[PDB]
Amino acid sequence: TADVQQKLAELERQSGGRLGVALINTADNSQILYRADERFAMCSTSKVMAAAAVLKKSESEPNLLNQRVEIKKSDLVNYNPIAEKHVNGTMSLAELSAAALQYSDNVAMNKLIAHVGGPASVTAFARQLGDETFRLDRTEPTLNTAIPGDPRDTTSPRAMAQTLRNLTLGKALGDSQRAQLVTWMKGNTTGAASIQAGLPASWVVGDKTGSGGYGTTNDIAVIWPKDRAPLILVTYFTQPQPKAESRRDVLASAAKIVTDGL
Numbered sequence: 001t002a003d004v005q006q007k008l009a010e011l012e013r014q015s016g017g018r019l020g021v022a023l024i025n026t027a028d029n030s031q032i033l034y035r036a037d038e039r040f041a042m043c044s045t046s047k048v049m050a051a052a053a054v055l056k057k058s059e060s061e062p063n064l065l066n067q068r069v070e071i072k073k074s075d076l077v078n079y080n081p082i083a084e085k086h087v088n089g090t091m092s093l094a095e096l097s098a099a100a101l102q103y104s105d106n107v108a109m110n111k112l113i114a115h116v117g118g119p120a121s122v123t124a125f126a127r128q129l130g131d132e133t134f135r136l137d138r139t140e141p142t143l144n145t146a147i148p149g150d151p152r153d154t155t156s157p158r159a160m161a162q163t164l165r166n167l168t169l170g171k172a173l174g175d176s177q178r179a180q181l182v183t184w185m186k187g188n189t190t191g192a193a194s195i196q197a198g199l200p201a202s203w204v205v206g207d208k209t210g211s212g213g214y215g216t217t218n219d220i221a222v223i224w225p226k227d228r229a230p231l232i233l234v235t236y237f238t239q240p241q242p243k244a245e246s247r248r249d250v251l252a253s254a255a256k257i258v259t260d261g262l
C-alpha cells in the first residue's frame with residue numbers, strides 16, 4: 001500500500017538515515033519494497049552467503065563439515081566471541097559456520113571465506129545461484145567500513161531477499177544442507193532487538209544481523225508466522241555520520257510496519 005510506503009518513508013525521515021526493505025510473502029507471492037534496488041553494505045549479513053557456500057561445497061565432499069581448522073592468535077580480528085575460546089586448537093567447519101551465524105564471530109567468517117577460496121569465490125557462488133548483485137570484496141574486519149558511495153561488500157535488499165528465500169525455502173541447497181542452514185539461523189543469538197523485536201512473540205524467526213561503520217545496522221530473516229506461509233524480510237539501514245550509533249530499533253520498526261495486519 002501507499003500506506004505502507006508512507007509509513008516507511010516517515011520512519012526513514014525520523015531515523016535520519018537511509019532505509020532499505022524487501023519483504024517477500026510466500027502466501028501470495030507478493031513483495032513490499034523500499035529502496036530495494038539501492039546498494040547497502042552487508043556487514044555480517046554476508047556470513048549467510050559464506051556459510052551457504054561451504055554447505056554447497058559439502059554436497060560433493062560429504063565429510064567437509066567435520067574438517068578441522070586451526071585457530072591461532074594471528075587469526076584474531078575485532079570480534080571473536082567464539083574463536084577466542086579455541087585459540088591453539090581446532091574448530092570444525094560446522095562449528096565455524098555456527099559461530100559465524102549465531103554469534104557473528106568474525107574469525108569464523110574469515111575461515112569460511114578462506115576455505116572456499118576467498119571473497120571472489122563467495123561472490124562466484126552467489127552468481128551461480130543467480131544473484132548478480134551481491135559482491136563480497138574484502139575479508140573481516142575491513143568489509144564493514146560501509147562508506148557511503150562505496151560499492152564494496154554491498155548488495156540490494158531485493159537481491160538479498162531473493163537469495164535468502166532460495167537458500168532457506170528454495171532449492172539452492174540439498175535438503176540436509178538447507179535444514180542445517182535454517183537450524184543455524186533459528187539459533188541465532190544476536191537478532192532479538194532487530195526484526196524479531198517488530199514481530200509478534202509467537203512467530204518463529206531465523207535471522208542474521210550485521211553492523212558496521214556509518215551506524216550501519218542490518219538484519220535478514222526467514223519468518224514463520226503462526227499458521228501462515230513464511231516470509232522473507234531484509235531490513236538494511238545506514239547513516240550519514242561515520243561514528244553514528246547502532247539503530248536496531250529502526251529495523252524492528254520497519255518489520256512491524258511491513259507485517260502489520262498479517
Ligand SMILES: [Cl-]
Pocket residue numbers: 199200201202
Ligand atoms: Cl506479541
